[model samples]
Target: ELHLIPPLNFSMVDNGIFRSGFPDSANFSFLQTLGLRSIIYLCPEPYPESNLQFLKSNGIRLFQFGIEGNKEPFVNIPDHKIRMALKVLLDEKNHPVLIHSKRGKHRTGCLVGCLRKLQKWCLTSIFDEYQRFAAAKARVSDQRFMEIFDVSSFS
Candidate 1:
């Protein structure tokens, strides 16, 4: 049986804004103008729920995943949290998904890696996307985050 799933059409924009409240009003308005239908915020302890409400009131779909972890060395979220995030992301992958973490690196990188695998993203495409993260203002160390998951070279 050929179970053909529909293609998920969405744009991935890395607007590195974590722990700094929601993007500025001007930015949000701009995003609305650009026709971005929805946003997925991947951060622990999102401050000011009103901001989220305001965005929603403006017709922007918003999803959030709180990632709890310890300080010291930073990237120390529990495996369960990662798994939960992965589950939520995979389930919502078919929609217009935009993921953002503190720096849009380490945590975001790991999550993206998992999504790529879950969605069967091509190796070349995945590598290309991974490389793009480096150009971002944030720095996600491969050595540190890569070790968290066993799938290094996804072919």
Candidate 2:
């Protein structure tokens, strides 16, 4: 029988958008449950061969932003590329999408946090959501980036 719950670290961020850490062979069954149309990967690292094969086999489109995975104090978040990726995420054609990173923390959180800004969410709500995911490793720079991120273009 197919599992109903997503694998570890996976959570639904919107009606059709889910966020998670990298999925492995063991998590395939759970992932298939989403009937995903696309995946937004947000890390600069190369995509794993197995995941590429999985996406191809499932006919899921891949949108990679390739953001560098630098930590706090030295993080170099890319605003333009993130906006580009958000453009794709906002399109209805890509509904039932999944955004992920190595651990689905910093990079994914930043993207989702920005999306919240685009939606006009209050900063307190945005930071709360981001911190919930980032926990002790949360970066002030990320919050700062989200606070100053421009959403007027998308608006």
Candidate 3:
């Protein structure tokens, strides 16, 4: 499975969901193996041309959350947008979804971390999983955001 992922950062978050950084052209073939039905892009940037073409060709829908990559302590993280994206991601019809950001670190981690919270996971376990992928680039701000993010709206 590692050999098939182009970016080498991809992983399954659940039976029908995947998470990763932006996929390069070579990675598109590998992405097809998931039979992906949708992609949840968590950045403010437009989709890369090759990715757009691949999604269109493969009949995959895209749900762009477009959260700004702001790191300031006082900067807003747009909890509403996160919840909106989660709404789309949590839908069964959107199964086999791939969630991602530029590096699949901050924004992606925050979302998955919030999902873990919704799943009633302990904070230690959630942060451990987040830090595993983020490594040296892990943002304390992102962790803080996830810690206080509201999952009450999920149910």
Candidate 4:
């Protein structure tokens, strides 16, 4: 049987965007199937060389946003950076991209939440998805940020 291990919390954010928890060697093959063009890595820590090599080998561009921690949902999130990240996700050219964090719960959920807002999804629905992913530790800060997030900046 063919073996392909996917990263934790993997889910399709939309047509070309994907989200998940941190991926390791075991998940590479599954990731290969996605034909990803870019990765939105949501951590400030240094990326492993092997992971960097994987991206280089696959021609995948790395778009990293170094948010220090998710303990407080990225300290209420760097709104500008989220907007910038959204710029990449919403662009057709950046299709087949992946967004990931340590656990694919709070950080990834928040980013996906903002994207949902930009998509004109209602707050209740957005938070629902957020809570679903973060059943263990759904940060209220994340929900609050999404609630106040201004989607008008993007078109």
Candidate 5:
């Protein structure tokens, strides 16, 4: 079972400084300390190699599934990328995954939505979870958010 924690982002801590809205370095450090075993970074640019190395030293393997898409009215996250993420998540089912994007909302929400759709979760369930997500944090656009459970493509 995947345990989806609240996502994190740079906006909450711009200028390399942690705001009250942002989690502290120790939050991530503590997560690492808790023995998380896997993480997935979804972006064009790579994460700091030192941090990656540090996580590796702590026994956390990192994976990347960068989706290049049309960033306009909406991001066209590819079917293949979602499929690849599913494969990795299943392949490493026993491991914990810390998936993130630059803002940690759009791409992350899209990926999470794909996972929920794959599992055939109900619209109500998805919406309920989304409500909770929005209440607790910033997220993808409402248009993108609604697409989370509209699995007509599968029909």
Candidate 6:
């Protein structure tokens, strides 16, 4: 078909950063267009063999930050993991990166929210971007953690 299909909830987080839901074979062509250098996987599962092959052939790295957001409020935001992933996102070498989860909702929002915090975005504005994606499933705990997250060290 020669058409590019982005993964669900796909959106640009900044210059070379992106966020989205789990991608499928259909999105492969679309992904190639971005020239992704790496991916941050936010789930605690094995990467599918098919996607693995895609990364292998493309020479893209995968950074897994396995989390259980359905309960983490979603388990506490896992500050350490979020912080670690941020480090990866911050490094310019990892630019053209894509971060994703099953739904690209709360957990994904948390990472992006934290990134915004580093960008010095106020809480209100941060929540707006988060809520825009999370919609009805938005968790107060996530917003709380994000607002209270100390980015001093990350900065």
Global CA lDDT of candidate 3, please?
0.87
Q: For residues 33-70, what per-residue lDDT tens digits would candidate 3 score against the true structure?
A: 88989999998888888889999999999999899867
Give one digit per residue, the lDDT tens place, for model 4 in 12-59. Answer: 888989999999989999999999999998888888988998999999
Specify the poorest-scoring 10-residue window by lDDT in model 1: 2-11
Give one digit per residue, the lDDT tens place, for model 6 in 82-141: 888889999989989999998898778999999999999999999999999998888888
lDDT of 1 by residue, 80-147 (tens): 55566655544533244455555565556557755565456665565566556644433344424433
* Deviation of model 5 at 37, angstroms: 1.5
Q: How big is the positional error of residue 109 in model 4, measured in Å on the Cα after superposition?
A: 0.8
Q: How many backbone clashes does candidate 1 have?
A: 0
lDDT of 5 by residue, 28-114 (tens): 554543455666566666667566666767786766777774555565566666566656655545255555566555555555555
Better of 1 and 2 by TM-score: 2
Model 2 / residue 27 / CA error / Å:
1.0
User: Tens-digit lDDT track for model 2 on 1-155?
Assistant: 65555655788998999999888877877788789999999877788898899899899999998987666688879988789889999998998999999788888999999999988899999999999988898899999999899788998
Residue pairs whose backbone atoms clash in candidate 4: none
TM-score of each: 0.56, 0.94, 0.93, 0.94, 0.63, 0.94
Candidate rank order under TM-score: 6, 4, 2, 3, 5, 1
Clashes of each: 0, 0, 0, 0, 0, 3
Query: In angstroms, how far off is 1's CA in candidate 3?
Result: 13
What is each predicted model's overall lDDT from 0 to 1?
Answer: 0.50, 0.88, 0.87, 0.87, 0.52, 0.90
TM-score of 5: 0.63
Better of 2 and 3 by TM-score: 2
